[PDB]
Amino acid sequence: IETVPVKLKPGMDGPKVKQWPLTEEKIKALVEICTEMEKEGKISKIGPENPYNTPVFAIKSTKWRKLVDFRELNKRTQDFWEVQLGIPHPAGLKKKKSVTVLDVGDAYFSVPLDEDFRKYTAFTIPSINNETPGIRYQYNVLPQGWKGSPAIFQSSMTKILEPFKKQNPDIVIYQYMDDLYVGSDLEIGQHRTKIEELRQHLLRWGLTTPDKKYELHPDKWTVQPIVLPEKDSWTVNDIQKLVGKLNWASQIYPGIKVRQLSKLLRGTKALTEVIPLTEEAELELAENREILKEPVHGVYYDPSKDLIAEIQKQGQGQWTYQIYQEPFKNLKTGKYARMRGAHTNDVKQLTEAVQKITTESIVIWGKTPKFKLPIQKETWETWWTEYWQATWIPEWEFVNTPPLVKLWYQ
Amino acid sequence: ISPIETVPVKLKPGMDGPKVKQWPLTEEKIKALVEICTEMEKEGKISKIGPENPYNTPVFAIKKKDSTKWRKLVDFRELNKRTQDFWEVQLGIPHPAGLKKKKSVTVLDVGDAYFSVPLDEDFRKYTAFTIPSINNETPGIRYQYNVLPQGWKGSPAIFQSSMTKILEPFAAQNPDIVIYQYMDDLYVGSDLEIGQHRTKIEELRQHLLRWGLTTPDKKHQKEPPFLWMGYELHPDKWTVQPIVLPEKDSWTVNDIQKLVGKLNWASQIYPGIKVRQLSKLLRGTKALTEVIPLTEEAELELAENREILKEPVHGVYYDPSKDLIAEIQKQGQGQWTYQIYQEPFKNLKTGKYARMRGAHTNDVKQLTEAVQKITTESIVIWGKTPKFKLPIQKETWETWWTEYWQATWIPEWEFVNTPPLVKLWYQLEKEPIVGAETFYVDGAANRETKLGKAGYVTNKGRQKVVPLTNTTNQKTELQAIYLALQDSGLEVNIVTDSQYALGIIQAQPDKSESELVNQIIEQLIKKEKVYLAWVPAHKGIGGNEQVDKL
Ligand SMILES: N#Cc1ccc2c(Oc3ccccc3OCCn3ccc(=S)[nH]c3=O)cccc2c1
Numbered sequence: 039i040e041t042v043p044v045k046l047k048p049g050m051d052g053p054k055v056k057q058w059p060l061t062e063e064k065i066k067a068l069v070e071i072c073t074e075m076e077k078e079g080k081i082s083k084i085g086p087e088n089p090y091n092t093p094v095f096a097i098k099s100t101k102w103r104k105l106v107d108f109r110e111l112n113k114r115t116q117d118f119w120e121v122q123l124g125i126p127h128p129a130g131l132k133k134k135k136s137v138t139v140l141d142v143g144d145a146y147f148s149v150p151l152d153e154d155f156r157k158y159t160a161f162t163i164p165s166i167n168n169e170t171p172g173i174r175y176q177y178n179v180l181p182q183g184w185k186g187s188p189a190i191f192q193s194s195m196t197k198i199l200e201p202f203k204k205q206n207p208d209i210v211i212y213q214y215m216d217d218l219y220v221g222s223d224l225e226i227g228q229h230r231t232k233i234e235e236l237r238q239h240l241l242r243w244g245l246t247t248p249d250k251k252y253e254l255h256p257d258k259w260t261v262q263p264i265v266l267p268e269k270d271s272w273t274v275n276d277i278q279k280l281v282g283k284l285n286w287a288s289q290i291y292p293g294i295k296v297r298q299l300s301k302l303l304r305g306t307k308a309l310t311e312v313i314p315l316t317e318e319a320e321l322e323l324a325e326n327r328e329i330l331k332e333p334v335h336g337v338y339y340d341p342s343k344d345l346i347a348e349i350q351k352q353g354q355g356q357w358t359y360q361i362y363q364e365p366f367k368n369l370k371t372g373k374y375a376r377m378r379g380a381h382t383n384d385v386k387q388l389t390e391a392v393q394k395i396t397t398e399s400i401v402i403w404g405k406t407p408k409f410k411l412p413i414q415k416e417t418w419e420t421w422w423t424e425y426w427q428a429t430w431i432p433e434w435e436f437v438n439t440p441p442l443v444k445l446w447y448q
Numbered sequence: 449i450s451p452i453e454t455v456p457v458k459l460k461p462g463m464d465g466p467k468v469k470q471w472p473l474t475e476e477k478i479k480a481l482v483e484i485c486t487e488m489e490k491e492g493k494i495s496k497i498g499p500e501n502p503y504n505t506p507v508f509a510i511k512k513k514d515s516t517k518w519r520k521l522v523d524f525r526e527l528n529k530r531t532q533d534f535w536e537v538q539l540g541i542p543h544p545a546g547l548k549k550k551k552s553v554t555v556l557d558v559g560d561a562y563f564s565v566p567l568d569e570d571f572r573k574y575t576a577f578t579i580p581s582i583n584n585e586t587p588g589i590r591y592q593y594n595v596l597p598q599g600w601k602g603s604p605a606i607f608q609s610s611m612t613k614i615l616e617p618f619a620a621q622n623p624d625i626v627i628y629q630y631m632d633d634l635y636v637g638s639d640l641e642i643g644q645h646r647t648k649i650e651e652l653r654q655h656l657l658r659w660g661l662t663t664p665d666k667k668h669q670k671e672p673p674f675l676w677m678g679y680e681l682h683p684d685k686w687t688v689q690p691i692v693l694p695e696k697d698s699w700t701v702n703d704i705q706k707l708v709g710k711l712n713w714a715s716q717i718y719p720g721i722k723v724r725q726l727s728k729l730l731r732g733t734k735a736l737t738e739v740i741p742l743t744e745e746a747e748l749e750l751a752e753n754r755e756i757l758k759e760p761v762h763g764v765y766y767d768p769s770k771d772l773i774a775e776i777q778k779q780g781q782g783q784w785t786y787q788i789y790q791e792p793f794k795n796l797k798t799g800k801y802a803r804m805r806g807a808h809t810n811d812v813k814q815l816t817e818a819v820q821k822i823t824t825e826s827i828v829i830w831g832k833t834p835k836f837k838l839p840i841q842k843e844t845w846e847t848w849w850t851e852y853w854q855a856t857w858i859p860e861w862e863f864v865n866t867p868p869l870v871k872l873w874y875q876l877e878k879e880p881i882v883g884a885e886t887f888y889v890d891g892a893a894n895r896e897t898k899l900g901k902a903g904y905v906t907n908k909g910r911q912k913v914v915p916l917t918n919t920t921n922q923k924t925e926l927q928a929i930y931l932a933l934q935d936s937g938l939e940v941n942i943v944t945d946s947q948y949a950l951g952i953i954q955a956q957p958d959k960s961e962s963e964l965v966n967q968i969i970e971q972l973i974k975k976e977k978v979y980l981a982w983v984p985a986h987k988g989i990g991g992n993e994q995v996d997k998l
Pocket residue numbers: 542547548549550551552553554555626627628635636637638672674675676681682683684765
């Protein structure tokens with residue numbers, strides 16, 4: 039068929055991002071993958087009159103998979119896939135009991151890409167020790183990881199899904215980049231059989247989904263409540279920490295009172311001294327505990343602002359996160375605990391946590407947040423692709439300031 | 449010229465060709481220009497044009513050694529500023545430690561390289577120039593370029609693509625011959641017998657000549673050692689070109705920068721080079737021609753470098769069949785040095801890491817940072833990460849990374865018991881110490897007066913307040929803790945309201961740019977148990993209120 043013209047935002051030049059150096063093992067995998075893609079027409083080699091570039095990576099199973107980081111090109115094509123060809127986000131997918139994610143990225147590879155736009159998809163396969171300038175390619179078809187690919191394919195996808203939507207009018211289907219999110223209130227077995235029905239329907243229509251032998255239950259998605267320490271007996275230190283955390287919580291929840299607790303510790307006492315609480319003091323504790331049990335007031339999602347995810351390392355394979363748009367206005371908080379395993383590199387847990395947070399943010403708001411990552415920039419840039427199993431890549435930055443508030447977000 | 453296919457070139461969108469003025473020149477200049485423009489036109493690299501072309505570009509004439517040659521110069525700045533961007537030519541160069549030994553290596557220099565590659569026809573009209581009349585009475589000689597002009601934005605990258613395509617047929621016929629490409633040169637290696645290799649070199653030359661590229665004969669072909677990019681490439685070893693550290697009485701900022709540069713350059717193969725003290729002098733250099741004094745530490749550091757540089761050192765080329773090993777040693781002063789080797793007495797390369805940015809640091813964190821720098825470099829040079837040999841015990845590192853706030857990647861490493869070792873010099877208590885005096889400390893200062901005070905009150909009734917001059921609200925908060933570290937037993941509980949001071953100590957540094965923090969570190973090592981606790985200031989909670997009286 040004829041191609042949909044793609045125009046960059048006016049006055050915006052193409053992506054000119056640097057290629058990271060890669061292991062020899064990963065370079066060879068990329069050369070192999072790209073040689074096959076060139077044979078199938080999906081990509082072609084290009085000359086020096088193309089100045090643009092987009093990073094490429096190799097990820098894994100036992101088979102090497104290629105991953106293009108289209109973050110920059112997506113920003114420079116936002117109008118094309120967000121305004122002109124935007125895909126609306128359903129607000130009922132979060133309400134579903136079970137949500138399954140299906141990879142439908144292979145559909146794009148049939149559809150040709152606008153000839154005048156191919157130059158902006160240029161990527162470079164790096165050489166070792168700067169021996170070679172690099173193998174340079176550009177896409178001839180809609181590339182995976184570009185946000186205009188699902189936007190262009192949208193009408194074909196809506197058509198292929200319509201017969202299944204008619205039969206199953208209570209099933210929510212939402213497309214974000216290369217994935218379909220399918221949510222139903224059915225029992226797990228019914229939902230699983232429904233997912234296979236959709237997989238077979240898509241296969242009947244020519245959409246291979248590599249799901250041959252991700253289940254998410256979003257009913258539990260909420261802002262977790264702050265939990266004050268419960269103690270049979272209380273020391274000066276214990277009251278001190280309790281008062282401090284309550285004062286920090288007062289920034290979020292107004293109405294916290296600690297004046298009675300402050301009086302309970304009087305004089306230059308000893309930290310290990312055991313101070314029993316006053317009747318008045320317990321009343322303040324009981325009021326603050328109930329005040330924190332309720333959710334915050336007036337915290338709404340602003341779709342004109344960007345979502346922000348903050349993560350803090352807690353130890354013993356436990357991580358906590360907050361998603362917000364303005365300070366102390368958390369839209370979502372959670373605690374990701376690594377599935378207990380031998381392999382436990384903090385990078386692996388951080389990488390797995392970032393993927394979990396990003397998927398929830400897609401299901402809840404239809405967009406990804408920008409992460410504040412508690413890791414050194416170079417360490418993450420070196421090792422993040424080792425455990426990366428997603429097709430998208432969120433924005434991120436690195437925080438060099440230790441929090442000092444880790445206990446507070448417990 | 450050549451039969452190579454021309455790369456299509458566009459002007460930057462919304463721009464047009466360069467229409468620049470041609471200022472007159474002397475008669476001997478206009479003469480030597482025509483003596484070259486007629487010989488350039490003869491070889492087809494330029495061509496006379498008519499008035500229809502509306503563009504123009506300045507032409508100048510200059511000579512070397514007042515030699516017979518009077519080279520032409522064209523300033524293509526206006527065109528270059530209006531031409532499309534191209535793929536960026538090679539930025540970094542191969543490192544000698546990443547080369548693999550070939551039984552024979554040859555170097556070939558391409559002559560007239562840019563002028564031997566044709567230029568896109570539709571783009572030639574924007575390259576026009578003029579040789580002026582003797583007195584602006586005669587008409588000018590309009591001309592135009594047919595090949596890649598020297599000093600044009602696209603010339604370097606179009607040549608490299610043309611050369612790479614030209615090499616493709618020979619490379620397919622000769623799959624065992626390695627050909628490095630770099631600017632106007634080709635570095636050809638092989639594992640063939642000298643006579644067999646010399647025949648393949650002559651084969652490459654003839655192939656390159658049919659494509660229009662001239663190349664030196666064996667009479668003019670160089671021989672090892674090759675002096676490439678400040679290196680010395682020998683048939684079985686590599687090292688840097690000789691370093692010259694000048695002797696001077698007055699060292700200007702520029703001179704110090706050059707000295708620090710040569711020393712960094714020498715550090716890739718000479719182990720132990722240090723540039724901390726010399727670089728510290730550079731801090732706030734400002735004027736490059738300013739004369740700066742030398743610290744006794746700086747002269748000592750420079751003296752040790754001269755001692756290191758006195759004897760020569762060389763590195764080895766890379767062998768993919770052997771392991772890649774990295775070993776790190778702490779030099780002191782926040783400086784580390786490392787070697788990368790596969791065999792014991794020969795190193796592929798060396799280097800050093802300094803944490804200049806952080807005021808407060810922990811040896812373990814620095815070691816982790818240095819590992820990261822080596823890992824990135826190993827990937828660039830060899831395409832893989834090394835097996836590390838580090839002066840730290842597993843229980844020491846496992847303790848640090850377990851409790852560190854950031855995520856850390858600890859690769860394969862084995863302990864090397866070669867002091868200075870890396871250890872945890874102290875550790876704060878995770879819970880308060882029963883049977884220990886509890887100091888409630890506080891401090892403050894006035895910003896205008898710069899006069900402050902630091903004091904404490906303890907649960908046993910002890911009280912002190914000390915005056916401080918020329919201090920900060922931050923320094924006094926650290927002074928309060930230092931006062932309580934002193935005047936206390938081997939086990940002490942310290943309660944502060946300063947999140948700043950708590951943050952610095954909780955990071956558990958072992959060195960800093962503050963003498964006060966260095967003194968606090970000394971106390972923390974000398975103590976047995978220290979628990980540092982924090983409370984909100986001005987909350988009037990317990991002891992803190994009484995200390996706040998200070
Ligand atoms: N000026 C110049 C210049 C000269 C040679 C270069 C170079 O040579 C090779 C070229 C091809 C394969 C291996 C090479 O090098 C292996 C190691 N090696 C090096 C030298 C000798 S004499 N013998 C030997 O084994 C690679 C890169 C840049 C070069 C620049």
